[PDB]
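User: hey, got a sec? need RIKEN cDNA 4930408O21 folded
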Amino acid sequence: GSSGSSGSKNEKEQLSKAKASVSSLNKVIQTKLTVGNLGLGLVVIQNGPYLQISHLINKGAAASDGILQPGDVLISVGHANVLGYTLREFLKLLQNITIGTVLQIKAYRGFLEIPQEWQDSGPSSG
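Assistant: Yep! Here you go:
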C-alpha cells in the first residue's frame, strides 16, 4: 500500500534538528490568477478552519504563479470570504467561476504549518 513515518528511528534513517529564534516577520501573499479553461483546480485539503493548499494543478493558473505556493491559507478567494470555507465548499465555489476571471487570492505564507505526513517525495538531497 503506502508508508508514513518520521525521522529519529532505530533503523537506516536520517535525524537532525532545525530550530531557530525567529518570529518577527509577517508577510501576506496576494496575486491574481487567470482562471483557465478548467480553472485553477489546486489540490487543496481540509486543514483546520481554513483551506490549506496541498498541491497546484499544473494545468491551471496557480500552478503557473510562482507567488502562490501549495501550503498557504486563503482568506478571500474571488471576493468570496473563504476564510471559514470548508473543503467541500471551496470547491463548489471556485467551480461556479467562469474562464478568464480576475480574482484576488489572499493567502498567508506563515499562518498554518504544513503536515509533514503529506509530503513524501521532497526535492531529495542525497
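Quick note: Strands lie at 28-34, 44-47, 50-53, 74-77, 102-108. Let me know if you need anything else on RIKEN cDNA 4930408O21.
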